[PDB]
mmCIF file of C-alpha atoms and ligand atoms in Angstrom:
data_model
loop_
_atom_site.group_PDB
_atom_site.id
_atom_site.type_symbol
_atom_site.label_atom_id
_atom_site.label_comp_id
_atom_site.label_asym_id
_atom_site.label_seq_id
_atom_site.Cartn_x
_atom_site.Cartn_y
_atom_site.Cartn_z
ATOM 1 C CA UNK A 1 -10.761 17.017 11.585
ATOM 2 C CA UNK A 2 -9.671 13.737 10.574
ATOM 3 C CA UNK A 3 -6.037 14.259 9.183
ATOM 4 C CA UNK A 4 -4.678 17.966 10.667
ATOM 5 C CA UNK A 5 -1.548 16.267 11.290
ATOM 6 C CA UNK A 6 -0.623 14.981 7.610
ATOM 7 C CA UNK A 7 2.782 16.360 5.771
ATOM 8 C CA UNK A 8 1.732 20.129 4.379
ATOM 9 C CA UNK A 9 2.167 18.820 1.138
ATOM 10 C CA UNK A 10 0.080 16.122 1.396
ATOM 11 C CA UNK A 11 -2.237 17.107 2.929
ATOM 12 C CA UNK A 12 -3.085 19.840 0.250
ATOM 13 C CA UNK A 13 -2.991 17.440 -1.921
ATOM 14 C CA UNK A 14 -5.709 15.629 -0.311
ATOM 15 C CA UNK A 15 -7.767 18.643 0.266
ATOM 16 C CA UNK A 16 -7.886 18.873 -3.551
ATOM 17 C CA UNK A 17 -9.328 15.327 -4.240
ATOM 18 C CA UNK A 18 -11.728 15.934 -1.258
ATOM 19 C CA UNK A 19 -12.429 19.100 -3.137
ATOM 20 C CA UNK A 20 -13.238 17.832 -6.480
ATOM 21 C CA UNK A 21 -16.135 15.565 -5.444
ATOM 22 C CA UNK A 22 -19.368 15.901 -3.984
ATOM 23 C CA UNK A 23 -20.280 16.552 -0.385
ATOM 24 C CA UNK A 24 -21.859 13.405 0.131
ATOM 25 C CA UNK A 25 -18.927 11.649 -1.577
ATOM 26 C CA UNK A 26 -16.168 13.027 0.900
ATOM 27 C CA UNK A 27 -17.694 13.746 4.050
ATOM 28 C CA UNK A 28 -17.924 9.193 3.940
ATOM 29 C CA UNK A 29 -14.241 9.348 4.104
ATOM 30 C CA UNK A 30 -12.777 8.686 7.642
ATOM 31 C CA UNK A 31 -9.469 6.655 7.075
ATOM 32 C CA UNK A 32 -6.257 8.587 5.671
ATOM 33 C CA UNK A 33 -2.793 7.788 5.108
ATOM 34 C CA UNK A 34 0.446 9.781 3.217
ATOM 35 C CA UNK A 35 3.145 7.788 2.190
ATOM 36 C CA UNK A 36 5.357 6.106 -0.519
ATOM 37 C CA UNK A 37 5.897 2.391 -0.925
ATOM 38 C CA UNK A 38 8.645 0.032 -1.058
ATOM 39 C CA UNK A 39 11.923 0.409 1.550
ATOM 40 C CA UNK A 40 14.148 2.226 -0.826
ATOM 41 C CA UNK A 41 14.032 5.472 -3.747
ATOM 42 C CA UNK A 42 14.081 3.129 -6.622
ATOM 43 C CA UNK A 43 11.265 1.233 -6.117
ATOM 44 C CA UNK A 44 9.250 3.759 -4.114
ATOM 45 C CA UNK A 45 9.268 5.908 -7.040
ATOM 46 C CA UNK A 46 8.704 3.466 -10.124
ATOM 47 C CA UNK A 47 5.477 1.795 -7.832
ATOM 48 C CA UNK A 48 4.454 5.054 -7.648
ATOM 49 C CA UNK A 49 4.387 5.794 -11.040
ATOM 50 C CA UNK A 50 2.917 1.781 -11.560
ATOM 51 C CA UNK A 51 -0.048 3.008 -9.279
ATOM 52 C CA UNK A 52 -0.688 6.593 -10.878
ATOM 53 C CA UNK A 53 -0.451 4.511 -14.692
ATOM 54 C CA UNK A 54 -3.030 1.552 -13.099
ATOM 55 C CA UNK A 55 -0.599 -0.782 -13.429
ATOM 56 C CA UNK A 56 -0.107 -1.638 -9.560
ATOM 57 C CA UNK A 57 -3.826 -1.999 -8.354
ATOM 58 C CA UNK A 58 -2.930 -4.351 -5.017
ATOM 59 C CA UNK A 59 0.169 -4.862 -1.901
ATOM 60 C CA UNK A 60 0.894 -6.982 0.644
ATOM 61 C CA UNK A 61 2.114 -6.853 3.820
ATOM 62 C CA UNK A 62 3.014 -9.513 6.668
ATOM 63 C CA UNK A 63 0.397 -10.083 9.358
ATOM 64 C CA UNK A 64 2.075 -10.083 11.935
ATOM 65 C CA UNK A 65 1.918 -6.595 12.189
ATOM 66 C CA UNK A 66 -1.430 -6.628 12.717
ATOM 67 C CA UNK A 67 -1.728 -9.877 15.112
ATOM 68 C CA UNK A 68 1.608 -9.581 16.995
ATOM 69 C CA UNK A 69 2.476 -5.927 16.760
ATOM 70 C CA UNK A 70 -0.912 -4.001 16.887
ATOM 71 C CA UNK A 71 -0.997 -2.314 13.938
ATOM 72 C CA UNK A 72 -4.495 -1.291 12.575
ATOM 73 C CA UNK A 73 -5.660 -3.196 9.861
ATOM 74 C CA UNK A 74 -6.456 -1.885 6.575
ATOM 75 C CA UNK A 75 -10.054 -0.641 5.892
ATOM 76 C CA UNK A 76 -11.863 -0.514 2.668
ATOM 77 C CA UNK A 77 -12.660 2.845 1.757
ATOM 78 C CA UNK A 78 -9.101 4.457 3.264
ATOM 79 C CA UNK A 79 -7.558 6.651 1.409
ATOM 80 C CA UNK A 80 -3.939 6.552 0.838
ATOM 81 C CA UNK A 81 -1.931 9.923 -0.496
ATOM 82 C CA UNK A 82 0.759 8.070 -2.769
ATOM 83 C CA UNK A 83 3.910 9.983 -2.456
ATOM 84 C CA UNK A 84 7.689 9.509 -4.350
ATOM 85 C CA UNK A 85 10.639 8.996 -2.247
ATOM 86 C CA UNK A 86 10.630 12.482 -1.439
ATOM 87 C CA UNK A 87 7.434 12.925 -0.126
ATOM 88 C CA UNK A 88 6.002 14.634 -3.751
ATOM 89 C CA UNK A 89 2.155 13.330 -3.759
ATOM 90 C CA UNK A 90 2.061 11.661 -7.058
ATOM 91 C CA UNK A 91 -1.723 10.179 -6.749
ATOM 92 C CA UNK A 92 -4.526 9.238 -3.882
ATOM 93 C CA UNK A 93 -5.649 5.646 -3.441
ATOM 94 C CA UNK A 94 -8.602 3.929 -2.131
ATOM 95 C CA UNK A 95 -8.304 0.700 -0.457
ATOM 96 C CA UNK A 96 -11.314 -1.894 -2.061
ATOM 97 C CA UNK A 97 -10.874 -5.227 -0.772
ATOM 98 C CA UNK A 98 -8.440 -6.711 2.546
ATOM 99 C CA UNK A 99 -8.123 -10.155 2.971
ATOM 100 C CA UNK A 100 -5.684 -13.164 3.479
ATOM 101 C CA UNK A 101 -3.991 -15.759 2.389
ATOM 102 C CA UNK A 102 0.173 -17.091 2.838
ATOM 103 C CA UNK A 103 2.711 -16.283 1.380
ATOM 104 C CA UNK A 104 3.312 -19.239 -0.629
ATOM 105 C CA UNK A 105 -0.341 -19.496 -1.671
ATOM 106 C CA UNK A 106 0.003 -16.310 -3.624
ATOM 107 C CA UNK A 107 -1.382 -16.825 -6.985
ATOM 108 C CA UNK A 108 -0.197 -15.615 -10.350
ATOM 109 C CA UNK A 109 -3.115 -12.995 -10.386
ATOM 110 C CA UNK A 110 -2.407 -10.935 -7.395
ATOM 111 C CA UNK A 111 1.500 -11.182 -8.295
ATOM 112 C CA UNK A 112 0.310 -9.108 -11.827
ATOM 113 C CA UNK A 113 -2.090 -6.722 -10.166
ATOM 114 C CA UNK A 114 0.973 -5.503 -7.729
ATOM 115 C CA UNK A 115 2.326 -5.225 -10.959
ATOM 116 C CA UNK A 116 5.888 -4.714 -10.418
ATOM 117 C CA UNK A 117 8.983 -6.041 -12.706
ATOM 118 C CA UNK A 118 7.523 -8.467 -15.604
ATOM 119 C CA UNK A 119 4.230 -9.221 -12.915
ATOM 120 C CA UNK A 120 5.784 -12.461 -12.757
ATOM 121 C CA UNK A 121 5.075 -14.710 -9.359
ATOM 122 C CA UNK A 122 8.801 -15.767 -9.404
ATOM 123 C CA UNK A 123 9.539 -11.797 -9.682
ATOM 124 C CA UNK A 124 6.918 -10.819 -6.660
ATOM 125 C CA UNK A 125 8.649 -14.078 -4.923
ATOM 126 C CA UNK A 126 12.168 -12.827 -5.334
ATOM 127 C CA UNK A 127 11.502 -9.202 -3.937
ATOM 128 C CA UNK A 128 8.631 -10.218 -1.387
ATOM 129 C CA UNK A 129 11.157 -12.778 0.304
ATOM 130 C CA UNK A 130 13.759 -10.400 0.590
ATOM 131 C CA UNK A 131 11.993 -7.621 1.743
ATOM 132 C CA UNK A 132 9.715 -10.119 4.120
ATOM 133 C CA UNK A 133 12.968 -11.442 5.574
ATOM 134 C CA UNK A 134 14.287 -8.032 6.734
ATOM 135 C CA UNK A 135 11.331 -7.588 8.409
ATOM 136 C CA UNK A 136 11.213 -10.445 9.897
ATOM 137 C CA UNK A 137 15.160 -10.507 11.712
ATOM 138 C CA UNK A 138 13.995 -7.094 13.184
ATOM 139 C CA UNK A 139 10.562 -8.570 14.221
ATOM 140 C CA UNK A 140 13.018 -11.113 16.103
ATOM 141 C CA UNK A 141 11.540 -14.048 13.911
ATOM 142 C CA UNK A 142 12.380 -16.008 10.855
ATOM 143 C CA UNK A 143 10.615 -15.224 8.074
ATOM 144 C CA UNK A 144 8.568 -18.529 6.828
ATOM 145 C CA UNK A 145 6.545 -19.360 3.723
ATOM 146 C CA UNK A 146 3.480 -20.398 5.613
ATOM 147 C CA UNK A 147 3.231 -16.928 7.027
ATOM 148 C CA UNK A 148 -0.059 -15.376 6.533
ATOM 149 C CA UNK A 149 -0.206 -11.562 4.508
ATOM 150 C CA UNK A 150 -2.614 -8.787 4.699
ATOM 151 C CA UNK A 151 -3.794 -8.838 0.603
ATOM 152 C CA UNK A 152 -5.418 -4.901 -0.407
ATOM 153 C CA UNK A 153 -6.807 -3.539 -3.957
ATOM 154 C CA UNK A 154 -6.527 -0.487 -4.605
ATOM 155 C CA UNK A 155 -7.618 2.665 -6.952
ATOM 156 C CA UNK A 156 -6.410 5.615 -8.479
ATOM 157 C CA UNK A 157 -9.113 8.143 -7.520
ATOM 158 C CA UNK A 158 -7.086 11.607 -7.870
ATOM 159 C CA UNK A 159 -3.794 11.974 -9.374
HETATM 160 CL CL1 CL B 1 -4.089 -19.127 1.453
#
């Protein structure tokens, strides 16, 4: 009932996890997403491999999606179908913690839990402001430090 309209391969996928664990376990589930990260093949496919290894365990995203645009914020206990550029499912996550905090407040911690290049804060800075900054022109703002992001955890809980 709750995700009929999910990519075939996906959605198998998620049938499979669902599956695998108890009824009590996954009738709680009511929040599901397919999809890969990042904007482009490279790094959609090397995060998903960091996630599926438990070496990317959090993301971020601008607020102003949420606040401005509508968007639905992120729930704890959603489930996420990780796929590669090309739509392979490589692993399920589940969201455990949302919060916030601005951009240049992010700490050295959550820049290693998303885990990407050397987990570095200068590297999450480089590729964050970049990527934030895109966004941003097609928003029809500029993108500023003090903007506020949408922090998640997540877990590997079927691969
Ligand atoms: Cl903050």
């Amino acid at each position: 009932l709750y995700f009929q309209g999910m990519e075939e391969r996906s959605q198998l996928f998620l049938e499979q996890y669902l599956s695998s664990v108890s009824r009590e376990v996954s009738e709680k589930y009511t929040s599901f997403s397919a999809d890969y990260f990042c904007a482009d093949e490279y790094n959609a496919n090397v995060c998903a491999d960091l996630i599926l290894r438990g070496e990317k365990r959090a993301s971020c995203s601008l607020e102003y999606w949420y606040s401005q645009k509508g968007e639905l914020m992120p729930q704890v206990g959603h489930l996420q179908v990780v796929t590669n550029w090309d739509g392979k499912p490589i692993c399920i996550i589940e969201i455990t913690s949302v919060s916030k905090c601005q951009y240049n407040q992010v700490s050295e911690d959550f820049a290693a839990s998303e885990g990407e290049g050397d987990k570095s804060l200068a590297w999450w800075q480089e590729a964050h402001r970049n990527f934030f900054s895109r966004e941003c022109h097609e928003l029809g703002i500029e993108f500023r430090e003090d903007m506020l992001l949408v922090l998640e955890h997540f877990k590997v809980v079927y691969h």
